[PDB]
Symmetry: D2
Subunit: 283 residues, 4 copies
């Protein structure tokens, strides 16, 4: 499937904009298989527990959705999980504790097993932001658990994807790395949860379809066509993503201060986005 | 000066223990120049905003104290700062935003200038945990600000300490790295805010005194004597620190789950701690 | 194509074994499209200029071959290039200078342009060993040069492969990373120069063929089947490669002292190799 | 002591200049306790075995000197060691094998023990260039050996220096990091083998003397005064070092191509060097 990690709107002063959040979700959901709320591009860690709960209550997804859970401890995680469950989330996408990760030890397994005991979840490996590893050994140890559905791997390290493919069964792999999308698919990924899918959801869907149908030549051409979009967006992060959505007329809002309202890569990104839009691949 | 980053007590289930927190602070404060509440060893990021405020309200320091502020955004930082100010904190020890740090840009300066506009603060560089850098260029740009008192550098990279010494005036440098303490002092540090000072506060004070008084030979011998304690504690992190304090009879509590109640380094640390205790250097 | 980086045989005392080198090359060449002499798995840097020239003179490839050139300066590179040219090498596979790489600057381009002026070459990016980067910006600047045929990328970072595919024409991409082989092919690689091809050359050829012919399902199954072999070999490096070849009866010799004659991963590798051999995929 | 790692002169075309090498050594040796030939700043790895032997034969040190030995294998190391011994070198400064370091294992100890069996040596830890680690565990295992005199540590990681000081006896520690010199001295270093000593040998000697004599305030002021020189030189590397020596009229020659004849940091370095020269601290 193709799911986008929708951003969480804030006005210029940094106030959570619930109305915008709901409108944004409704404008994108029809174009994709489902939504990922509070993913790595969703600024979940920029919200207090109160805002976190408030933001999710403002949404009303019509399709099965995922909720990212990024906490440092089980006590802090408990509320996030209860909120996600009450919202009707299909599963959680949980990252490993970060700050004291070096002292975690076997606590990593204890963390995921505790959460999996209460709700289905996908392991969330996005080191570019969390800056901590999720050893393949740990993934293999957790893979047998009925409630550990699979993993969203945003690292862009396809050696990991190849590993899941060769050694893990009953384990659904989702890549969060747009630039190597076709490569991940070749290596067994079920699909992609891509920030770029917020902009060209139909294009990534088409790429996935070409691959599934064996139209390799067509898949490669689309992969090459989408490379610049995915590559630049990865470099621009949240500020670029939100600026792009605002440019297209969607209520994505702005990154929470002190982060910049505009991306230094806008000048380079604009023509790339407009080009795809002219081709009919945007939204 | 010598200040210890006091841990924040949780019972085995992970519940904040306000009573223990207050008792712990009262048992250590007399032995040091002041306390650092919610420092990197204080598990501040393991608390919700509500627990954070509750924990600080439970304390009643008699000496000027510092409060660590580790948030990702200004909106989240505002409450933490107001709470610290109301508690009578002498200054904040603030770390840079982490999760989306790569997209921060000049927002780093905006972050600190916003906080410094409301309260005096020390820059907090502890990359081992925050996993993000605080460029010397940024430190030099912030150094002129009247409310940016100085910096606590826990990196153990004395090239940075040497830099502050040679290029920055009106900038108070505190090292948070125990194993190279004497080296930092030689390179101009005003003192140390060390986790090891929770265990042997009088020893680090003596080392500082020897250096200040020019008793270099005595300083080197004490530095060598304290090396094992500081080295092992750094490897053991919060779990080792709390287990050591509990062993000495203080109400340090336990790390918040999923972190381990006991450290894998205890067997190696025990004799080191007991040895210093027998010499009369503990608490 | 499929080319193996043949190892350079040394007896147990570390003496170059020319006879073994020639016999080894003759035993493998028929099974592949060509050979890579002195590749990263060939211990070229373990030879003196004299041994380097002697070793190559001992070979008599019947198929177009490549010669790896790993030097720190142009003066040192000159002899290596002249030797390769006199041997009839189709092209060089040159790595960037290493030791003072941080001070190289634009000298990187000067290095490759100087070599390309005298002989056709492939850029050699194998950071795991050279421990230095080869910026995509530099690759793009060098790509237009008629004598810079392409690049062998052993990094396993498929974002780079995707980049070459989307932005570079007249640029032949070879991956040196076995575990993600199918992923690289999906992302445009012309083929692979794999250490694992020294053991199962026909298998990697079959995988390449399946992909080229659009037999994706068959390609994925073979990719999964070969994953353990490629993954373990990458971890075992040269010692494991040579021990495996010796086990199969080929005169691969031993790593030059102080490197170990046997790999710590042999016990885990043995059954993997024997399994593929029983299936008929070895040599 | 204070020893400078003298550069090895090459003309603009990259030809080894034996005459210049000898003149350079004679111009610096009187100002220092001894010389380090083929140190990390000496471009030893930029020479073929023949040039290496030729270069050393051209020198005639009057004071006890050290010779750097940077090879990948024992067979390659043998000649370098024999040459150094025949030249009358007091000891070797050997780095660990690099290219296949990950597969070295216990071969690291075998390497040093083999060399130490034939000649006295200092371990050489300069990761910025070799890009490989030399575990403290390995240093401690090698420390008891009679012919392993000590270690030159250029890492700038004073935690390592503190370790040697607290745990190792009969082990002479030399720091190769100028910016933290006073810090290293405080932590027990016997002295420094600094590239900056090629320019201001008397200044670093004075700093060492101040520390040894307990004149801490004077030591700190000199440490601060020399910081800019050492900091910039470290950033400029060999090209900056040679350009500085040429500027002062010494026959340092140029870096071997493709490295730049001039450093991009010259404009910033010039005033720093001239300033120290005007103060009377240069050569
Ligand atoms: K499962
Ligand atoms: K200030
Ligand atoms: K070309
Ligand atoms: K010794």
């Amino acid at each position: 499937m193709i799911l986008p990690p929708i951003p969480t709107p804030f006005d210029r002063e940094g106030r959570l904009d619930e109305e915008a959040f709901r409108e944004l979700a409704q404008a994108l959901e029809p174009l994709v298989d489902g939504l990922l709320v509070y993913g790595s591009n969703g600024e979940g860690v920029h919200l207090t527990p109160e805002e976190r709960a408030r933001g999710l209550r403002a949404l009303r997804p019509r399709k099965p959705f995922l909720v990212g859970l990024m906490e440092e401890t089980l006590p802090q995680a408990e509320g996030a999980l209860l909120e996600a469950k009450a919202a009707g989330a299909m599963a959680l996408l949980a990252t490993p504790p970060r700050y004291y990760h070096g002292s975690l030890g076997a606590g990593l397994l204890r963390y995921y097993e505790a959460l999996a005991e209460k709700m289905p979840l996908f392991l969330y490996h996005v080191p570019q932001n969390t800056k901590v590893d999720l050893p393949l050994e740990a993934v293999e140890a957790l893979a047998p658990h009925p409630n550990v559905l699979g993993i969203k791997d945003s690292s862009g390290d396809l050696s990991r994807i190849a590993f899941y493919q060769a050694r893990l069964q009953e384990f659904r792999v989702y890549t969060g790395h747009a630039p190597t999308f076709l490569g991940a698919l070749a290596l067994g990924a079920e699909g992609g949860i891509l920030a770029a899918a917020n902009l060209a959801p139909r294009a990534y869907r088409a790429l996935l379809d070409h691959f599934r149908e064996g139209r390799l030549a067509e898949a490669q051409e689309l992969q090459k066509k989408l490379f610049p979009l995915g590559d630049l967006l990865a470099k621009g992060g949240v500020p670029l993503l939100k600026q792009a959505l605002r440019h297209l007329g969607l209520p994505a809002g702005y990154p929470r201060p002190p982060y910049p309202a505009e991306s230094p890569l806008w000048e380079r990104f604009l023509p790339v986005l407009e080009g795809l839009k002219e081709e009919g691949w945007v939204l």
